[model samples]
Target chain A: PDLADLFPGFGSEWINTSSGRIFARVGGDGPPLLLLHGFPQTHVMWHRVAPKLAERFKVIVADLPGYGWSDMPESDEQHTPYTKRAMAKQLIEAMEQLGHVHFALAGHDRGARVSYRLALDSPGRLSKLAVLDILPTYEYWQRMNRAYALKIYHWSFLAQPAPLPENLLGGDPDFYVKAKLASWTRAGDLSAFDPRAVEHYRIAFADPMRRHVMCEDYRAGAYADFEHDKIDVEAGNKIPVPMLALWGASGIAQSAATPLDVWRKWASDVQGAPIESGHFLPEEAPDQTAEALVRFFS
Target chain B: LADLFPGFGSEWINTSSGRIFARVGGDGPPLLLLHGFPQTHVMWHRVAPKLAERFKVIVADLPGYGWSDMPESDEQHTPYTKRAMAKQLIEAMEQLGHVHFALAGHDRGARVSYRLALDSPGRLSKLAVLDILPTYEYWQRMNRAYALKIYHWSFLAQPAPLPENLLGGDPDFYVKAKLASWTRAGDLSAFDPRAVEHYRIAFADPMRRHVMCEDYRAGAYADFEHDKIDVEAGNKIPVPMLALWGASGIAQSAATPLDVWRKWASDVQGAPIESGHFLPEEAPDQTAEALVRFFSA
Candidate 1:
């Protein structure tokens, strides 16, 4: 059992938030830093880098609700359960429960989406925010080209009416999950991903409810999440905290016109670079990912 | 299936491109009926016979869909482009002994119909396009709502075998779901189970699935390019045209489908049918009435 505990010697717990129960791994002995994993993945995605980050900071790695060991709440007409604002709220409470009212944050893919939302909504809750391999949700829809749309087809596919995607994916979760994980990587295979981590991600897809919530998560991105960012931008609201935007050298985010330029418009103080990997920076380039966080958070 | 088109003679006509499966019937001037995606010519079963009383109706599948030949494609996916499909279809009409025929197409077939109208200038007398705007308009006006409404324009158009694998994994569910989703009733209540069965049979084949994706691939790439060039060159449809769309359908989400067509054709008139994307199957009587009113002239 301990061997399966991806972050060895780390304490694991299920933290309840308004959105749902979030599975988190808590460890380390220094300043608090939380890591949020993206779609088709779990906290264990950081197993390669979390232990290293823990050497300098208190690391909290958690699953975004509706993914990986989290509860699947009912989706409303607005898909409220999976909205980035709702998901961001869970992060705030989970951090508060750990006695850190304010913290530094790092997130990849969908997790990065929520992290940016937190910076804008709460403002003072995070000292620094690092979004891995993604652009602002609003800019994404605004600038979607046919090429990028094909790369991230799930944003639209998963957002379709209930259970269509769920049943289709349920047909062969193993192939679908592995295929997605493999495609977004520079190596173009699962070699960069740990077998255990890959299987853990597949488990979420194998279950019916998990699959349903996964689509809801994307539905929220298409409607609620995209709209929230749009309204804020129109009101001239921006993320007040310092922000670091790291994209994969060859990831989907790189397809944006200029990732940092896009982020710079949304946040006041922003710095960014391209990690020498694909979408899953933590797993593919853990040393670089950890060092980037250490340098920014410190 | 013949029961769907009673007194109709089925034949496989050989065009230079390939064999085209068709249902031939009725007795007046010649008119070809083309069917759309995730479906076969059987989609016209309900409406064709009614229209047959007044016109020589030739209902057939596009080259890659239904029981027709599935031609090989290249990196350009040229064979699947509306130009290529239209060129082949023109030959198909001439071989069937109609030098000039009225044409009406639904969905993807509608695109093919419009393409034929543009590329083969003097071949068509009058054209009716059901439930679609031009490919250029669809891509240009893809707002958040339109993007979500017709996600398949990009999804199915992805580099080969990607959409094929995902959809092929559960082909039956994919077809039925799309049918139900785009229908006004949001269920199969509007479709005849027999007609739906024909769609299921064709979709179950992986080749057919890939061909369906190629159809959209061309829609997004070559097809879009073709329409754009025409729009830029001030080339509009030179013949009489009519557009009919669903009161609540996929095409209306972007802009008024008929209004969009107005910019592309010199002479065009259109109205909305109280149905869904599959206009012929969902509202056959209404669809026939609209076609009859236009083609009678």
Candidate 2:
């Protein structure tokens, strides 16, 4: 239940940035490795995987902007401030503030998106990158259809203007978060997630402001992030850093296209395989996720 | 528009599943005009009257919409599946002494026409679908823009009470929003106030809301799977098909509507009209002319 208990020797800090302040942790004595989290979750997403990862790498796990203890930036029309580009900038700044300019990075869900943009925009700042359970933003919109629509309805639903998603999801935030976790996991249940961790996810997302910002984050993904991706694709800009995509075999990512196939189109040097889990790869298959990350980062 | 169908009379046709409300008139070959979602046969209010001049026009409300009887959804949502709906409409036409007829549908009606043409091709002489693509193609090509614009497809398809309960709370707001949202100008001005009232009143019945949910539920689940089976079995639209769409609507932006339709029909022809999703209401003259030309040819 305690942060020290879960993260062991990790120390916490509030890193200031252009948008606001982001809450993160720094621990371990090996190479620096930043770990970012995704939706309906916070840094605790890596409680199981991060501690293990910390054994071999300095793991910096943090709440994504507008999630967990991170500051919720003001909403904008194009959700520009919440764009992966914006969030990526903040994370890069946060990493530098911690005296780790060059580090390996890994992100899951929404965090994976930020990790992606970070690698593309600041390739020199990262030695390697790992994205969990997703495809490039542009590729997602281009290949979306009914099956994907039904599977990931939240992508569009959350990006609908603002208060619309807020009100709907806010009506029953607990159910919404819990349902997502339960439905998206390989076991079709939340047994893999620590009850305390699940409770933390619920409490973090239950905030009305957090819910609204989360929606804005997705809104950015659909609009500004999508546009940015389109430009990047048109300009033939690729992820210069070595990248690894780890996906859930049972999740929606596999439904559209192979993660490895899709990522190869965006990055010059990329490789990935499916974990025997669902969207919540870190929680569902921590051993495999941690093993893969440790071997790749090492 | 009313004067255009001088001798047309409103009546109810009882079929095995439910009773269908239709306005029948004219004297040549029988032609059926089916309406789309959130509206009724009344969607054909402007187009059907003029169409009656060249053929015996039957503008009927799809079952569970407008004045049509609302049947309970079965375990598999079959009562609301396009296959079952098509069967009911065909039987009604057969009972009316028109065993075979030309067909034109918009939105939801277009979906039904698709199923009918594929399942019971002998009953349809010619089929013209407006503002839609096959369910299989639509689901396979769903993207963010399309999903954002048409979130209701998934919202309505959600298992009962979820959509029904919300829409029931404010049927007027929901119905009006849909009508305004789909128009070219994104306003209700394109729709007649009287016709809007018809949709509002019918949607006000929570049971009808459930029925509508079942319709989409079937579309998203049973209907889509059925379509996949049909396509895999090499069962195509046997009759001549015409696919027309609103140039400014999802049918156009989501995909190349004509090309999408060609994959499902043997003899297909299509073109876009200058309108939005509500083509019949927004561009009745163009819609009427297109149907007349396609059906006659």
Candidate 3:
């Protein structure tokens, strides 16, 4: 479908953030909704989901600086450090720059963690929240079982010292992406991504800096993010926003059985459902997800 | 210690159905050199001649596809699954002579080489797969462009009648087509005539073509079906492999096939030569240099 057919007012601009110049797409006209993506993917994951919500909400999608059509800066870690929290701040700033003070947020995979942090630190800003296919950070580390470990092994594998997997995966981004997407999806729905869309992912991972950004994102997941979540949970810092969770019963995270009740501990109102697809559920199960968002928000 | 390497000889192993014919040469270290499908041991004639000057060489005709005795029916061993083929190849070497060896394989041979490395890591000293990654990895990553370019893999791997009938019309089509498509202009002129002859003669019948499908089909079904076997075995080749691919062919075509190599094998070193898929035959000098360097190190 032509993008304009769904996103009538759909347009994008490069917004400056501490991370880099990020590509931000703003469309439709209602309450604002922030969409974030996960590992090895970019803001484009919401392409199908965005059009559905654009009519009722101002859908804002950004390329998160390193993964998509965004400026990829070398790691200074001190400056332009594309860590998850740092990336979150960039998103929040981009939204605020676009004249948004309060908005609903929904994210999948890596984006889910960023959304979690955005709501935590800036509680007043997020009106409602939805996290797709993930448990809280600390919850994952504390209880990552063998089955879960086998499924998401690359997260740990990439988190290893560089020149190893980097060189290995550097041999073929397409192969690496195929392996990651294949192992994650049982039905092998990687074909769900169009050829052009697949190329966009190839370009994203081709850059070493972007590859580093992904490794760093998961690095924080295993280390700093785990600790921060633990402290936040102990301090009773529940995010004061309505939450909706959607998980693919076939995903790697499903192996851990990231219980919805666990999310309820932090969310004042939480509801969830499991869909039959791979990790890229938005593309695989768009109609069902859109229905959930429309019902919950309305 | 009788060279402590290259454990097998040509007369050693037989299929569960009992079929064996091959040759094992050289000493010091056993290095298995596997030729592509629809070809014979002569595929490695140029490169192995030079490599054998140093390391022991085990260049054998893969059963059914080449000079190796064809089984009465491929029903039991036609496709020669990589694991089964690997076991037989190792057995062929042992039955004839040596017990263990280093390994290098090209194209069809590379598929079997991977299984050998995966199944009996301890038996191999080092492993090298030339110009091809795992079959599952290749198929999973296939896009339209990839699909079109490597059309032979798809065509041959397909179920019967299509591949058999198409090739039956003009048996020489496969040999000529494979030779034309496999390399660039310079490589085509430079490709070994003996290698071409080996490929041409092997696919002269319906059975040989059928065997090719089963080989690739095994990759699609049996090999992948038993993926858990490798994972469960914690199968890691504790030897060093110098993965050599035609830089011209592999670098432009693949992102990092070597990366996949290191994950399964214990230690991997790499060098990309500016040649085509037929590197050993097309650029024997460079291929030999790489073998010398890798073996010495």
Candidate 4:
């Protein structure tokens, strides 16, 4: 499918940075608003919510560094390029070059992870921040008990050294992607996802680099991102902007702890609640999610 | 493979929990030898006969492994946990007419042996844990190095059919890689071709793959919790304990094997054998000699 098929009338651009180029589709005409995507997904996740929000704000829906049409730069052992800090740094430059000095930012899953780091590392730049269906990277790893670990096994599974998860996931990437997307939904299937969007995710994930970057992404989650939060927590670092923590009522994040309660630990001004969905809030519960964002980012 | 263990009689005993399989031979003091994962009682094929010289060795497969019944799957992984597996093992031994016997376990079997030692202290006259630390230690000390060295703990523990599905794609490739990777030599040379065939058979079964995953799921949840609870309650292993580790196995994957075992067992002695994770097959003579002396002691 054409990338713009999902986001009608949107113009796509690749913002080249020192490290790499980022792919994003821009539309609407008002205040700047950035929509970042999660694992095994492109900015196409915003298909449902982005259009609604675009009515009020200029929406820039883009893929994170390793997903979609973005550059898959060679990563060091620390998975430096995939770290939330590095991704956030590159993303800020992209937003600036795209003519947005400051914008409202919302990210989902791994992108939500990147969103918070941007808020922390580049504080005061995001006018407001909304993270969908996720807690902080460090918070998740520290809380990986038997119950939570089983629910979020991918944190560790994907973080495992290269070739193991890569080999296994490669055996059947389509099944793996579909299983994760479907299982994390409240209805427990793909009914919430447009089949074409699902197909888009499948084609993107079919790339070996796309699959390997998932490992690097989590490796950074465990190693680099983990230390970033650890030191930040110790240094009393918090997201400067008002933060919106929207989680899936029946999703993996909310089950571990109250989303607001956990987010408040990292940010002083925190407010939000559960949307009636699963991990994919933008798609699964777009109306509720968009309204929440519309009210917060307005 | 059957002829490898000369003069040994194969037997299957039915316990209330499930049926157990064993290769029994030799005669003196009764001793039970248990094997590890991605393997069966066949793991002890190389070393059992020598230990059998001084003891009536009952070389058996742990529940959810080898010829044993896969039993029923569960949310808690109850059927595959060390405690459940250990209880069935006790009955299997008792039915074989040995009420109290010396026990030695390698890899996953060692996990079951230790759990049995803690839960039923009097059942084991002596305990030999081979090439493994307490499951809790591995979890508690699970840093990057240790986690990397033993990645399977989390991978297999992934929700059912996920790990099973991927592993099933190329069963031989997965099994062979697993058997080869953890060895000191980093190959399957130490494993007899016949024995490797047996391992291939065990892992290739759909039911066994699911149960094997259940075994790890149990390791991460039920098994990990039990060990932690016991450690906190000061429940120590009362039986005499001997820890034997492969020079390059998981014993040093984190802390020293002896030091870690010391915290869990009241009385413990240990030394590294000249092998890797597959101690029995790779260092059978040294493994057999260590067992003879320890059980005799």
Instruction: Give the top-scoring candidate (TM-score).
Output: 1
lDDT per residue (tens digit) for residues A201-293 in model 4: 988988989999888998898889999988999899988789899999999789788989999999989898899999999999999999999
TM-score of each: 0.95, 0.84, 0.52, 0.89
Candidate number of the best DockQ? 1
TM-score for predicted model 3 compared with the true structure:
0.52
lDDT by residue (tens digit), candidate 1, B1-297 = 435787999878888778889999999999899999888898999999988999999998899899889888788788889999988888888898888999999888999999999998688989999999998888887656777788888878877666776786789999998899899998898889998889998999988888888898999899999998999998999989999999888788768987888899999999999988889988899999999889998
Candidate 2 lDDT by residue in tens digits, B1-297: 232245789779999989998989877999999988888888887888778888899989899988888877787899889999999999889879988999998888888999999989999999999999987777776667678877777877865555665565457777887788788988888777777878888888888888888998898998899899988888889799999999886688779998888889999999898998988889989999998888878
Interface RMSD of every candidate?
A: 1.9, 3.3, 16.8, 2.8
Report the CA-based lDDT of candidate 1 relative to the real structure: 0.87
Error of 4 at A213 (Å): 1.8
What overall lDDT goes with each candidate model? 0.87, 0.85, 0.67, 0.88
lDDT of model 2 at position B44 = 82
TM-score, cand. 4 vs. native: 0.89
DockQ of 3: 0.03
Candidate 1's displacement at residue A16, Å, is 3.9
The CA-based lDDT of model 3 is what? 0.67
True contacts recovered per prediction: 0.43, 0.46, 0.00, 0.23
Ordering by DockQ: 1, 4, 2, 3
Model 3 segments more than 4 A misplaced = A1-8, A76-80, A182-186, A234-236, B1-297
Tens-digit per-residue lDDT, B188-286, candidate 3: 476566557657777776677777766755655566544446645666656677777876664237458678666666788877777777777767788
lDDT of 4 by residue, B1-297 (tens): 345677899889888878898999999989999888888998898888888889999989888788887789789999899999999999999998888999999989999999999999899999999999988888887654455457688878977778888887778777888899878898999999999999998988978888889999999989999999999998999999999999898777778889989999999999898788999998989988998999998
